[PDB]
Each structure stands twice: as C-alpha cells, then as structure tokens.
C-alpha cells in the first residue's frame, strides 16, 4: 500500500489533479488508495474511480488493437515478413491489460459491491464488474474465455434486474448499463439480435418516459441515448 499513509481526502484531491493533468495511471492509483480506506464512495468518487481505470484500460485496449492490426497484415500470403516481435509485444500489452482488469475486479469484489447499500451504487459496481470482465473477454481464449463471459453476463444481468426495479428509464447509470450490456451481446456473446433488441428497447423506454430526466444529470442521459441510437445505426 503506497497510498496507505495518505489521508482519504488528500487521495481524492490528487485524483482530481491527476484527471486534469490526464495522468490516468496516477489517478487510478489514488482512487485505489481511497477505496482501501474502507469507506463507501460518493457518487462523485465512484465516477472518478471509473474514469481513471476506464482510461487506463482504454489506452491498453487501443494499443492492443493497433498491434493486432499490424499482426493481421503480417503472417499472411504476400507479406512474408514474420518474426516473433509483433506477437511478443502484443502479449506484453495483453498481460498488463489483464493485470489492470484484475486489480479493478479485486477492488469491486473486495470491497465495493458487498459494502454498497444504495441500489444505484450496487448497480454501478455491477456494471463495472461486467465491463472489466468484458475487457478480459476481448483478449482471452479457451476455457478461460468461457468463464469470463459467464461472469460478465451474470454481473450485467443482476445489474439490469436491480436497475429495472429501482431506477427510472432515463437514469444515466441504468442507460449506461444497458448500453454496455448491449455491446456485450454484440461484441462478446455473439448475439447481435439481442444487442439490437436491448439497445432499441432502452432508447424507446427512455423516450416514453423522458419526463423522468433529472436536473442533475440530463446531459449524461441524453448523451447515452444518442450513443444507443448511434450503435443501432452501425449494427443495423
């Protein structure tokens, strides 16, 4: 624990400074330290935790994709110029990406999910759980991949059940969850029909109860609603 001796409030402050400086590794490290104090996170703090790790793993995924693309052109008829280098470096990125996902899922399992009381917060962490299993799924293989897919679905599905029961259809976390579960269906579980179905339903039910938009978060809600519509444009 490199953050064990620092005040919780100071860690939260430095996370925000790191965000402004676009130092997402540092930001993740500070928020990890804050979580390990053992207190629940406020809404604001949960968003910082998510933004930090989302950007870290996002950079790794992006790098993975670049290397994967390069590797496709190589090891091919016509482009006979192989060598182990591309694979090796891609596997290096892969291992680090797995390391970060495991860290996040570790924090969630110990100790954000069980300590959550609010229904909004429980869904938030279950959505996160689904997301970081999804990211593991994108680079996994074999029996490992199968276990990961099941864990992602199970986390997403429980999140959905709670969100349908406890949250209005325009709630940004509910919308964000359905959006990403939709992506899971399309990109991981190989179920594009269910991806389209969920995305559409979510959008239409948000529109049907647009009056439920919150003054505090309608910008988030409308943005996710647009993202749903954009994915539907691509997928159909």
């Amino acid at each position: 624990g490199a953050m064990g001796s620092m005040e919780r409030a100071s860690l939260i402050q430095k996370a925000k400074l790191a965000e402004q400086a676009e130092r997402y590794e540092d930001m993740a490290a500070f928020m990890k330290g804050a979580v390990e104090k053992g207190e629940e996170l406020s809404c604001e703090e949960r968003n910082l935790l998510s933004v930090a790790y989302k950007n870290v793993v996002g950079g790794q995924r992006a790098a993975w994709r670049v290397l994967s693309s390069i590797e496709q052109k190589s090891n091919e008829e016509g482009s006979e110029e192989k060598g182990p280098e591309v694979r090796e470096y891609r596997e290096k990125v892969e291992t680090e990406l797995q390391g970060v996902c495991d860290t996040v899922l570790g924090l969630l399992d110990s100790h954000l999910i069980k300590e959550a009381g609010d229904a909004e917060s429980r869904v938030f962490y279950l959505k996160m759980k689904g997301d970081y299993y999804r990211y593991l799924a994108e680079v996994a293989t074999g029996d490992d991949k199968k276990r990961i897919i099941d864990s992602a679905r199970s986390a997403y599905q429980e999140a959905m059940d709670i969100s349908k029961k406890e949250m209005p259809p325009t709630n940004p976390i509910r919308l964000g969850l359905a959006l990403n579960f939709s992506v899971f269906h399309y990109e991981i579980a190989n179920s594009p029909e269910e991806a389209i179905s969920l995305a559409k339903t979510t959008f239409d039910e948000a529109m049907a109860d647009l009056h439920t938009l919150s003054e505090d978060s309608y910008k988030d809600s409308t943005l996710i609603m647009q993202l749903l519509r954009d994915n539907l444009t691509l997928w159909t």
């Binding site: 647009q226 993202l227 994915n231």
Partner: peptide
C-alpha cells in the same frame, strides 16, 4: 459530445471490420 460520439462509433466499428 460529437467528439465522444465519433470516438464511440470508431471503436464500435473496429469490431465490425476486424
């Protein structure tokens, strides 16, 4: 917003293409 939207579309498109 349109920047976030563009990024999203490109990321989501990557899967479809590759």
């Amino acid at each position: 917003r349109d920047k976030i939207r563009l990024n999203n579309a490109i990321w989501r498109a990557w899967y479809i293409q590759y």
